[PDB]
């Protein structure tokens, strides 16, 4: 698990402190415990220093555990660094062999190559929609782009470092992404002591997006006689 420590985490297999992925395990006692102990499986007992995330270490050279040198194969203060697991079937649970699979993930940077078993919809344009291209979700209006993406490029971004164009995975054409429109709504009135009449301004909104209707520059104004 990420952020853990102990002779497996420290010397054998380290997960990064922000691991994205799943850890999966099952007892393997029938496959991996042998009648006299299964010495096919061993673990690193000693290191000079703890290994980095996803470092692997095949080293078999003798470890030194004191101030004095050990210029040779054996001693009192120096050791062979790998020790076997005594996996006997008479071992209690917790002392039995577990097979482990760590599925470790990388999200979008390039377009994805591994995805879940979903199916694509048809593509619609000039309408406000939700979308999901290769796991890149959003909501917006899709338009055929005139942006000159180079052949390797998948997505396009504005000055704000926000997506404003995309490549469809199925047909390699480029779509401009525009946010579905929003604005302040303000109510205009002569005040209740004069009348319950009101007019309404959709601020910065075009009247096609929304009984008198009037396109001011302040927004679409509704319920006022020009």
């Amino acid at each position, epitope marked *: 698990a990420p952020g853990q420590t102990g002779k497996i985490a420290d010397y054998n297999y380290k997960l990064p402190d922000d691991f994205t992925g799943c850890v999966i395990a099952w007892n393997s006692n029938n496959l991996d415990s*042998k009648v*006299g102990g299964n010495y096919n499986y061993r673990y690193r007992l000693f290191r000079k220093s703890n290994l980095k995330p996803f470092e692997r270490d095949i080293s078999t050279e003798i470890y030194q555990a004191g101030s004095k040198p050990c210029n040779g194969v054996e001693g009192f203060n120096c050791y062979f660094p790998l020790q076997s697991y005594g996996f006997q079937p008479t071992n209690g649970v917790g002392y039995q062999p577990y097979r482990v699979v760590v599925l470790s993930f990388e999200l979008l940077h390039a377009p994805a190559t591994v995805c879940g078993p979903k199916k694509s919809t048809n593509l619609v344009k000039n309408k406000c929609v939700n979308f999901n291209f290769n796991g890149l979700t959003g909501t917006g209006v899709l338009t055929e782009s005139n942006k000159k993406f180079l052949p390797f490029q998948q997505f396009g971004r504005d000055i704000a470092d926000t997506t404003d164009a995309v490549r469809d995975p199925q047909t390699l054409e480029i779509l401009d992404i525009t946010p579905c429109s929003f604005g302040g709504v303000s109510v205009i009135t002569p005040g209740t002591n004069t009348s319950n009449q009101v007019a309404v301004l959709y601020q910065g909104v075009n009247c096609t997006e929304v009984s008198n209707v009037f396109q001011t520059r302040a927004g679409c104004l509704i319920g006022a006689e020009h």
Partner: antibody
């Protein structure tokens, strides 16, 4: 198909020695524990011995401990029982057997059985 | 090798469901989910029917099933047939790492 096939059983004198042999095929013999089990005429099964996959570890029933010796050839795929100081109560059908991925400690596959007759 | 206790025999009519009860100790049956059951037909070698208290090997009939409570372990055979007419041996590992068989039960089907 897995086979265990056995030889060396016969009539023998008390106090004598005899060697049983069990050839193995259709599985990776050297990956599994190998067993001897016996059955006196008209009686139940008695466990006799086991040997580890590599032969480094051996275990015996108290009825044969300090007398018998199990051994294996992982190049030939052959299991042996050396029987020494045979007693009339060693008179039985002897079966070799073996583990599998169901469990190394199971007697999953069995030989045809070979009869040993310790008689004066 | 202090044997597991078993009934000397059991019997039933075809199509009945019947049970064979093994018994051991905290060193063996009570110590491990390792109880194994061997069928043996007359004049031939044993075959494994149930292992790890209740698992079946491939090709064994789903008529055979197994259980454990405390120091006691059980085989059940549901819907008896003439092919069930055999000796059944319970077996266990032990914390001594010795294997122990039971006394053997003959199933006499009333055919």
């Amino acid at each position: 198909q897995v086979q265990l096939v056995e030889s060396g059983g016969g009539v023998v004198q008390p106090g004598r020695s005899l060697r049983l042999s069990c050839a193995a095929s259709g599985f990776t013999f050297s990956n599994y524990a190998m067993y001897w089990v016996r059955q006196a005429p008209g009686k139940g099964l008695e466990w006799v011995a086991v040997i580890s996959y590599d032969g480094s570890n051996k275990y015996y029933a108290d009825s044969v401990k300090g007398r018998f010796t199990i051994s294996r050839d992982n190049s030939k795929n052959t299991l042996y029982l050396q029987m020494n100081s045979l007693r009339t109560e060693d008179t039985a059908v002897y079966y070799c057997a073996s583990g599998s991925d169901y469990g190394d400690y199971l007697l999953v596959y069995w030989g045809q059985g070979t009869l040993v007759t310790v008689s004066s | 090798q202090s044997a597991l206790t078993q009934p000397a025999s059991v019997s039933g009519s075809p199509g009945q469901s019947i049970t064979i009860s093994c018994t051991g100790t905290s060193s063996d049956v009570g110590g491990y989910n390792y109880v194994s059951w061997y069928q043996q037909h007359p004049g031939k070698a044993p075959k494994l029917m149930i292992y790890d208290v209740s698992k079946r090997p491939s090709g064994v009939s789903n008529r055979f099933s197994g259980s454990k409570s405390g120091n006691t372990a059980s085989l059940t055979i549901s819907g008896l047939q003439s092919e069930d007419e055999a000796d059944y041996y319970c077996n266990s590992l032990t914390s001594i790492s010795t294997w122990v068989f039971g006394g053997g039960t003959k199933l006499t089907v009333l055919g």
